[PDB]
Ligand binder design. Structure first.
Ligand code: ADP
Ligand code: ADP
Ligand code: ADP
Ligand code: ZN
Ligand code: ZN
Ligand code: ZN
Ligand code: ZN
Lengths: 373, 157, 105, 641, 539
């Protein structure tokens, strides 16, 4: 007999996660969260942990792993494993019934019998405080397969655990010294230091972490003082910053109207009563928190760019701060040193959850859903 | 003047003047190379004296060991510097209706780096002809000058 | 071309996807060994330069060690061998001469 | 038992199960589906179709989900549509013929023997657009809600190929099989053989129409992080020129994947596949938003007949609805009933709401058979204090109007209001995209922060505001193109808040002529008092009494789904003639302003005729001018200053 | 089948060309002219005969025409010989072109459908470019590289390289040949670009364009920038750039069955565009002299023209005179030196907004055949002046009919003139300091002809006309471009109740359906043709 292989009957995708330091020191290595600079090349093959900013992602799309082909005159299927970025169609029928036959009849691909996988990829840029003196946050390319695929979203900090591997690329022929390789990380498991609010279910360890916080009482004043306790007093400001996070309630009228369930605040004052420290403190405590500045890029930096996407032949909108943040806090500083082109973007976003553009290739209406502090 | 260059007297010596625009890079050409057959383990040597596209010399087609059998033994070979110059007709005297024309110009050994872009010069040279991988006419060639010596106004600016 | 100073006879060996006997193979990535390649391009120091002229620059290849100890804009001294490798023009077909570079030691 | 490979489908078992449903369905969803007379619910619609020639069977898929015996099928056509719809093509023909043979009938037989019947299944479940469409969803039914940004030219695609033989006077034809033309090398030997000499002749072949359309996709929810996607989708024959730029749409089809050739040199294919929708149905209209101007789209209403497709363009209404409409029109307070029900969450402001209602009706549109044209519109501006309806009104208009781009501030400039030329990266050619106003050739274009738009940008609207056209001379294009949009604007005064101690003409910080070329200007100043703002506060907080405002039925107001059915009737079906007797009260109202320019006069006729579209009056009467002029004067509080 | 049927149609069509011969005698019964037209065509060898399709439809109860027009490109080889053998026997270096015109319908090119490929079709639109008239290979000699044997019988539309037989069968490879450039026929060939009619574009769609190609004596009968009508063949042409589009692309392959033991598999992609091939062109859109003479003999016609050069505008005789006069020239070559002069007249219309000054530009562009209209903000110099297409499609470069190269010999309606930039107004003034226009890019230098009048509508700095300022200060356009205007017309408005009631009446009285409120003394039916009699008068 000749049979379907077990990898083509494989119901499921298999992944690994490492062992945390606790299990390394308990019973006395395996996963230092390495810097993208620290990787020193010759780790190729290893399972490694790296942490940094996921600056940019592609959209998920199918990429084929096996092509299934149909031959009528045989009835046997032909399966071609696809391994590199490219393939050539195995049009000449390889079947065991046509090999010892005069006629070598044709075959046609089946676009559902072809085993795919969900493919996505991202850059991680170096985590800035780990960059040496004078050096630059260089970047690494990560490839994803299967069920993990949406766990990476831009503008967030993650541990990636996965297997670090070569890819066949070298430059452009002359700019070469033989048998060079590109390299990528095949992602296996993800954890992220500021978590997604959308996952929040209650299990044997998280309820008691809430309950032990409550039972001391005065929780509202306990948390206000626990915000930015490294700066003096002024609790009324820091007490309101806790409300900015919890934000109130989004209301939909059930009749085609929406009103902002969100808090927008200004911290007007003179020098010396610290501001950016409170802005920075709330950027850390806010998942999806973002920090901004008065001048320079902020026109595009508060707006959708448009970009020819490196990995695949399509344009994409790239989100500035008000779009790299959403459902979360955007922090603005030196505020009045912004300009009319910045304000007339901001002024719409406090009033309502959306931005609108109508220049060049961009005509969209875009969801902000940000709190401006 | 370049305006009076003609297909008349191709490959005679020519005397002409202009401004050097640019001076490119000191590319490296052979003058002795030692060569071994990668299958015959057999050695020769080749020399070139003066010619430094469709001309000069190439490695011998074969010494069976088939085509292109030869490895250049770089560590027992001698090389020379040559340079590409461009000269254009002085913008003080050119047609009102159009841009100046120019000539590709080349020089070898000690004649390199003698001249700085923007100096005023007279060249004595061989007005010569080469084929350009254009992309020009149905069948054509491109003119160039091999400098065989050079002189100038005593120092420009 | 970059592992010996002498022009060793080239050995364009083929990556083995099948055994001498004909069997399949798989790759033991990380029992295999690797090394860092880098090239850095050095142009003349601008205060010694006879100013007004264009910059002129040459390509330096670094093996595994020194890769970490250069960055753009710093003043750097290199030592090495100014090899003139390949065979442009005289082999293959057609001009521009040999690829010249320094092996940084 | 028979079964298709890779598949859970039995042909005959589905065949009889579909017939069993097709000969017995009667609105069981109303009984069963949730907590929500007729009979033979489809047989009337089938015996309807056979005399009309409309070969399409538009199918509400959720008929099957509720019904007792075809839950076994809903999850098949959803998951095997290419094969399950290929069954329906056959069963419906046999199920037409059962209605022949049970009938004493004329010769329907002589064509329906040969003709072909098809299904367009659309009423399926919601999805998060492109993003949730993981590869497990490949080759399944899907739907998308969104809008169109551009559509390609019609593409010729082979369906019968033709072969011409360089000798011996016999040709050949071959039908395409699944993307190949297996060209015979042999010269059809039995005539004679020559090994390789045969031609392929282009202009003898038979072609499909194909068209490609670019969809801006807008889900009912999008995850935090997302940005708009330009999906690319394809539409076949009988849907070409169904839908086009600016339409707001629900579309359904099969999600697909396809490779791309890396280059024009060699057959190496990218392994990271491209994806698209093969459209099977498009729902051109909805109950919630009104109907595209029937006068404008007159060119395509006949093209749908000439092209033989009944993919609908205009809302159908029954006599039981029109009878209600007319019985509603008789009441004395319709003039305020709509002006309340237009925005049940917006308090007072009924001068504003009412003139906006009279914008939506448009009024009258007219032409001189070659030389001239005039249109019913009013172009609107809102001015005065912050903290008022202004921004919310621009949404409710946007969400009722079938067309319009909510432009905003300095974020909107000439190259993107009118058209622009851009590289289509998916093919790498220059192509022309409709700008914001061009997409808005109809309905409303809704503009906000109108005075914070630049001195350079405003100069486009300065033509469009009454001339309703834009004219272009830049590289690649020289044309004047239609810009039938009504325009509505939000503005704020010089400085902030309001300042009655300065004349409004200065206070607005908008130049006197452009301010005049608006047809109606609203002054919406706050002028605070008790016994108004208290009543407002109670109204607002009742929205937080019940965490969704289902009790908003209080303070009786029309269902929106009826209001849109009214307006899209009155708009479509009445052409109100300004009677010669109406002049005498009209001219004095203009001259009384003159003691200001013709734009007021040219506005009053376009506003008063809308007040005759409302109440459905074929002719204007001397009264309806009286409310229109008072509205103009009171919209700017002309009595005060 | 039609290897049979085609001869039956040839016998049918040649019979239509035989059983009809010229009657109309004494304006009585009618019978088609074609033999008399052939007996005219005898003199000139032009071989460019025109057939009215409406005269064809009545024979055979239309069952000939409804067949031929659908099956056209498969019967066209038989109709052309269906002419030849009639010509060979009523009449004794030969090529033919044949047209059918006056088809019963016009199909807007948005409703081009592939169901019509190879059929006859009627098209109209705007021609956006023309191109260099070129030879098309047609019949050509092909010579073997192996022996002096030649073939002249041709395969020519595509596949134009490889005849299948050599007049001695033996060759060391028989299939392949070289052409000859000397012994060949050739025909003049042209491409023109046609654009959708702006009166009939869809809502929000862009003005669709398509490529349409010309052969023979129909060449050089298209003219840029104007309405044209066509009839001809719904051709299809191979297109490569459709790679990367969704859906399967049909790929052909040579079969593998019944040949054994002898892109090497033999495969091709056949993806096509839909151009058009047109056989007929016209520039769409007696008792006349008895009217032209009749008007000039009358004393008032000037004053009738002043109150009829823009019938709907109320008052403003000043601008009406100006525009009427602007449609009429002055002798440009009025010099001895051999440099010409600005014989044409330029006008600017000015005043506070809500003047009807903009209406004139719509009336003119509705009326003056060599006129075009621009918003003047939405513009660029490279759209007013002609652009160039950079040597693309394997031909040489081509010049793009800029809006101000167009409107030669007439008026350009530059509405909202002042919102132009410094760049394009200087481009204008360099095209007024000289009648000529010059262009440079890519080293290709062209000087275009131009000779034009501008009608400019302009607005004061604040819209309101400052009575107390000079026009230089009020209008804010630099003195050189404020020069070269023969007149400025200025309008100032205020309440004048005796007029305002007559104006208000005129506006509202206009809104009664197509009513006579704007009835002139006389209409365009003579006014345009009288203006042409006035132009060629040269006083
Ligand atoms: N009340 C305070 N308590 C603790 N630290 C303070 C306080 N006020 C100022 N600082 C110190 O001063 C700095 C604040 O600078 P800041 O005033 O925020 O700059 P800016 O003028 O932009 O607001 C911080 O580094 C902080 O350590
Ligand atoms: N009279 C009113 N009736 C109903 N809602 C109101 C009223 N006044 C203010 N609002 C509420 O205030 C918000 C309006 O913000 P808005 O005033 O549009 O910003 P802007 O000041 O730019 O117009 C909406 O959520 C609206 O519901
Ligand atoms: N004398 C007139 N004849 C006809 N229409 C007029 C007249 N005066 C004013 N109009 C009105 O002016 C409008 C034309 O716009 P226009 O005033 O030309 O704008 P702009 O002043 O910006 O050029 C028309 O709608 C028309 O009703
Ligand atoms: Zn097989
Ligand atoms: Zn040898
Ligand atoms: Zn044959
Ligand atoms: Zn021969």
């Amino acid at each position: 007999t000749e049979l379907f292989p077990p990898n083509l009957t494989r119901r499921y995708f298999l992944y690994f996660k490492p062992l945390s330091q606790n299990c390394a020191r308990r019973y006395r290595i395996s996963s230092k969260p390495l810097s993208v600079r620290q990787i020193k090349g010759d780790f190729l093959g290893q399972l490694i942990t790296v942490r940094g900013i996921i600056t940019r992602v592609s959209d998920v799309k199918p990429a084929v792993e096996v092509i299934a082909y149909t031959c009528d005159q045989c009835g046997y299927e032909v399966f071609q494993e696809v391994n590199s970025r490219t393939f050539t169609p195995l049009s000449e029928c390889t079947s065991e019934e046509c090999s010892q036959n005069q006629t070598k009849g044709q075959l046609f691909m089946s676009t559902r019998a072809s085993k795919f996988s969900a493919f996505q990829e991202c850059k991680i840029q170096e985590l800035s405080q780990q960059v040496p003196v004078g050096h630059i946050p260089r970047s690494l390319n990560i490839h994803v397969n299967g069920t993990l695929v949406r766990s990476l979203s831009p503008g967030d900090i993650v541990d990636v655990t996965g297997i670090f591997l070569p890819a066949p690329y070298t430059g452009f022929k002359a700019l070469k010294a033989g048998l060079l390789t590109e390299t990528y990380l095949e992602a296996q498991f993800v954890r992220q230091h500021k978590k997604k609010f959308a996952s929040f279910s209650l299990t044997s360890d998280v309820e008691e972490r809430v309950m032990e916080l409550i039972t001391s009482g005065d929780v509202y004043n306990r948390l206000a003082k626990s915000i930015a306790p490294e700066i003096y007093g002024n609790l009324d400001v820091k007490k309101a910053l806790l409300l900015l996070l919890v934000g109130g309630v989004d209301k939909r009228v059930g009749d085609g109207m929406k009103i902002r369930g969100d808090i927008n605040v200004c911290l007007m004052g003179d020098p010396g009563v610290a501001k950016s420290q409170l802005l920075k403190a709330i950027c850390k405590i806010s998942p999806r928190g973002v920090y901004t500045t008065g001048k320079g890029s902020s026109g595009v930096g508060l707006t959708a760019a448009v970009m020819k996407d490196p990995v695949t032949d399509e344009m994409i909108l790239e989100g500035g701060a008000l779009v790299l943040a959403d459902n979360g806090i955007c922090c603005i500083d030196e505020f009045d040193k912004m300009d009319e082109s910045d304000r007339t973007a901001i002024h719409e976003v406090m009033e309502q959850q959306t931005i609108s553009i109508s220049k060049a290739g961009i005509n969209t209406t875009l969801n902000a859903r940000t709190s401006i502090l | 003047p370049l305006r009076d260059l003609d297909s008349e007297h191709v490959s005679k010596i020519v005397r002409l003047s202009g401004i050097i625009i640019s001076t490119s890079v000191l590319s490296s050409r052979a003058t002795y190379l030692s060569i071994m057959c990668r299958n015959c383990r057999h050695t020769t040597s080749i020399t070139i004296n003066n010619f430094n596209t469709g001309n000069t010399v190439s490695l011998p087609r074969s010494c069976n060991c088939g085509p292109d059998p030869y490895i250049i033994i770089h560590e027992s070979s001698k090389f020379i510097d040559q340079q590409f110059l461009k000269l254009q007709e002085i913008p003080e005297l050119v047609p009102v209706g159009e841009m100046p024309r120019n000539l590709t110009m080349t020089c070898d050994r000690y004649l390199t780096n003698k001249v700085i872009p923007g100096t005023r010069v007279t060249i004595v040279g061989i007005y010569s002809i080469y084929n350009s991988k254009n992309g020009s006419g149905v069948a054509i060639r491109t003119p160039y000058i091999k400098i065989l010596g050079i002189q100038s106004d005593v120092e420009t600016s | 071309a970059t592992t010996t100073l002498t022009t060793r006879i080239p050995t364009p060996a083929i990556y083995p996807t099948e055994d001498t006997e004909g069997n399949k193979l798989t790759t033991e990535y990380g029992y295999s060994t690797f090394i860092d390649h880098q090239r850095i391009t050095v142009q003349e120091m601008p205060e010694m330069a006879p100013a007004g002229q264009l910059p002129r620059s040459i390509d330096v290849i670094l093996d595994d060690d020194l890769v970490d100890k250069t960055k753009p804009g710093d003043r750097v001294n290199v030592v090495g061998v100014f090899k003139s490798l390949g065979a442009g023009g005289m082999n293959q077909s057609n001009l521009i001469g040999f690829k010249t570079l320094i092996l940084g030691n | 038992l028979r079964i298709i490979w890779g598949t859970n489908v039995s042909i005959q078992e589905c065949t009889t199960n579909f017939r069993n449903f097709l000969m017995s369905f009667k609105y069981k969803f109303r009984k069963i589906l949730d907590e929500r007379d007729e009979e033979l619910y489809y047989i009337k619609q089938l015996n309807e179709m056979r005399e009309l020639g409309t070969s399409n069977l538009n199918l509400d898929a959720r008929n099957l989900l509720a019904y007792k015996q075809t839950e076994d099928l809903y999850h098949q056509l959803l998951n095997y549509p290419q094969e399950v719809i290929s069954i329906m093509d056959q069963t419906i023909k046999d199920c037409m013929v059962s209605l022949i043979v049970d009938n004493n009938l004329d010769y329907d037989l002589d064509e329906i023997e040969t003709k072909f019947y098809k299904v367009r299944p659309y009423n399926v479940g919601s999805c998060k657009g492109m993003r949730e469409l993981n590869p497990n969803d490949i080759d399944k039914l899907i739907n998308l809600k969104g809008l169109v940004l551009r559509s390609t030219p019609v593409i010729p695609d082979m369906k019968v190929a033709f072969f011409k033989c360089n000798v011996c006077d016999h040709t050949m034809a071959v039908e395409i099989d699944r993307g190949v033309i297996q060209e015979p090398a042999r010269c059809e030997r039995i005539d004679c053989n020559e090994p390789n000499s045969m031609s392929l002749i282009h202009n003898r072949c038979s072609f499909a129409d194909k068209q490609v359309i670019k969809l801006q996709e807008t889900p009912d929810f999008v995850p935090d992080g997302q940005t708009p996607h330009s999906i690319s989708l394809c539409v076949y024959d009988e849907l070409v020129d169904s839908c086009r730029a600016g339409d707001r749409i629900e579309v359904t089809g099969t999600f697909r994947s396809i490779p791309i050739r890396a280059n024009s040199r060699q057959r190496v294919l990218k392994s990271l596949y491209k994806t698209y929708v093969d459209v099977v149905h498009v729902k051109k209209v909805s109950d919630k938003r009104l109907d595209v101007d029937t006068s404008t789209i007159e060119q395509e209403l006949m093209q749908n007949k000439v092209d033989h497709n009944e993919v609908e363009e205009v809302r159908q209404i029954t006599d039981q609805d029109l009878a209600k409409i007319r019985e509603v029109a008789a009441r004395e307070d319709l003039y305020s009933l709509l002006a309340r029900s237009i925005a049940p969450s917006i308090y007072e402001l009924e001068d504003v709401k009412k003139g906006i209602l009279l914008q939506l009706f448009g009024g009258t549109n007219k032409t001189f058979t070659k030389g001239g044209r005039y249109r019913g519109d009013i172009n609107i501006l809102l001015c005065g204090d912050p903290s008022t309806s202004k921004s919310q009104i621009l949404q409710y208009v946007h969400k009722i109007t079938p067309r319009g781009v909510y432009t905003s501030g300095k974020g909107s400039s000439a190259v993107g209001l009118t058209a622009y030329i851009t590289r289509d990266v998916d093919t790498k050619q220059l192509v022309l995209e409709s700008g914001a106003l061009v997409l808005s050739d109809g309905g409303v274009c809704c503009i906000d922060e109108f005075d914070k738009m630049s001195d350079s940008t405003r100069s486009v609207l300065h033509e469009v505001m009454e001339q309703q056209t834009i004219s272009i001379a830049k590289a690649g294009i020289i044309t004047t193109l239609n810009a039938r949009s009504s325009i509505l604007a939000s503005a704020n005064p010089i400085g902030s808040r309001y300042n009655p101690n300065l004349p409004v003409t200065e206070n607005i910080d908008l130049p006197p002529p452009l301010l005049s070329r608006f047809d109606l200007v609203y002054l919406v100043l706050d002028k605070v008092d008790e016994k108004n703002d208290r009543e407002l506060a109670k109204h607002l907080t009742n929205l937080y009494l019940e965490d969704k405002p289902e009790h908003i039925s209080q303070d009786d107001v029309l269902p929106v789904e009826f209001l849109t059915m009214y307006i899209s009737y009155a708009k479509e079906h009445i052409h109100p003639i300004i009677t010669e007797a109406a002049k005498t009260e009209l001219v004095r109202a203009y001259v009384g302003m003159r003691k200001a320019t013709t734009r007021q006069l040219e506005s009053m006729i376009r506003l008063a005729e809308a007040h005759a579209k409302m109440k459905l009056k074929n002719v204007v009467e001397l009264e309806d001018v009286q409310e229109a002029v008072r509205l103009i004067r009171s919209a700017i509080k002309d009595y005060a200053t | 089948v039609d290897d049979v049927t085609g001869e039956k149609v040839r016998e049918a069509f040649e019979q239509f060309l035989e059983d009809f011969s010229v009657q109309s005698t004494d304006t009585g019964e009618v019978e088609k002219v074609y033999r008399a037209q052939i007996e005219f065509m005898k003199i000139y060898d032009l071989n460019t005969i025109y057939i009215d399709y409406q005269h064809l439809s009545m024979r055979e109860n239309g069952a000939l025409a409804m067949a031929i027009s659908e099956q056209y490109y498969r019967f066209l080889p038989f109709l052309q010989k269906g002419l030849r053998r009639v010509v060979r026997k009523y009449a004794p270096e030969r090529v033919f072109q044949i047209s059918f015109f006056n088809l019963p319908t016009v199909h807007r090119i948005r409703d081009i459908r592939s169901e019509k490929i190879g059929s006859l079709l009627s098209i109209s639109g705007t021609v956006t470019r023309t191109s260099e008239v070129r030879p098309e290979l047609y019949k050509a000699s092909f010579t073997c590289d192996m022996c002096r044997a030649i073939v002249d019988n041709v395969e020519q539309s595509f596949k134009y390289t490889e005849p299948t037989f050599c007049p001695n069968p033996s060759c060391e490879n028989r299939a392949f040949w070289t052409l000859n450039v000397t012994r060949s026929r050739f025909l003049d060939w042209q491409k023109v670009r046609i654009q959708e009619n702006a009166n009939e574009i869809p809502t929000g769609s862009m003005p669709r364009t398509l490529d349409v190609i010309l052969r023979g004596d129909s060449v050089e009968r298209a003219k840029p920038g104007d309405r044209c009508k066509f009839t001809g063949v719904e051709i299809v042409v191979p297109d490569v750039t459709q790679l990367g589009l969704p859906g399967v692309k049909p790929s052909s392959t040579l079969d593998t069955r019944g040949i054994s033991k002898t892109r090497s598999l033999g495969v091709r992609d056949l993806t096509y565009k839909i151009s058009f091939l047109a056989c007929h062109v016209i520039s769409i859109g007696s008792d006349e002299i008895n009217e032209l003479k009749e008007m000039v003999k009358d004393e008032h016609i000037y004053d009738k023209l002043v109150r009829s050069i823009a019938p709907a505008v109320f008052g403003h005789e000043a601008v009406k005179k100006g525009i009427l006069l602007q449609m009429l020239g002055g002798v440009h070559k009025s010099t001895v030196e051999g440099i010409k002069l600005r014989g044409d007249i330029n006008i600017c219309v000015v005043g506070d907004p809500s003047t009807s000054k903009s209406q004139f530009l719509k009336y003119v562009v509705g009326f003056a055949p060599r006129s075009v209209y621009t918003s003047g903000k939405a513009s660029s110099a490279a759209g007013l002046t002609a652009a160039v297409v950079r040597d693309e499609e394997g031909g040489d470069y081509t010049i793009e009919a800029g809006a101000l190269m167009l409107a030669d010999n007439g008026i350009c309606c530059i509405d909202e003139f002042d919102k132009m930039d410094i760049s394009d107004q200087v481009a204008i003034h360099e095209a007024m300091e000289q009648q000529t226009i010059s262009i440079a890019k890519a080293g290709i230098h062209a000087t275009l002809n131009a000779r034009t009048s501008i009608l400019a509508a302009a607005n004061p700095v604040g819209g309101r006309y400052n009575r107390k300022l000079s026009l230089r200060g009020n209008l804010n356009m630099t003195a050189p471009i404020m020069s070269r205007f023969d007149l400025f017309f200025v309008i100032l408005d205020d309440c004048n109740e005796k007029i305002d009631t007559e104006l208000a009446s005129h506006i509202v009285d206009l809104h009664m359906k197509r009513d006579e409120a704007i009835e002139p003394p006389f209409s365009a039916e003579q006014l345009r043709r009288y203006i042409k009699y006035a132009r060629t008068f040269k006083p």
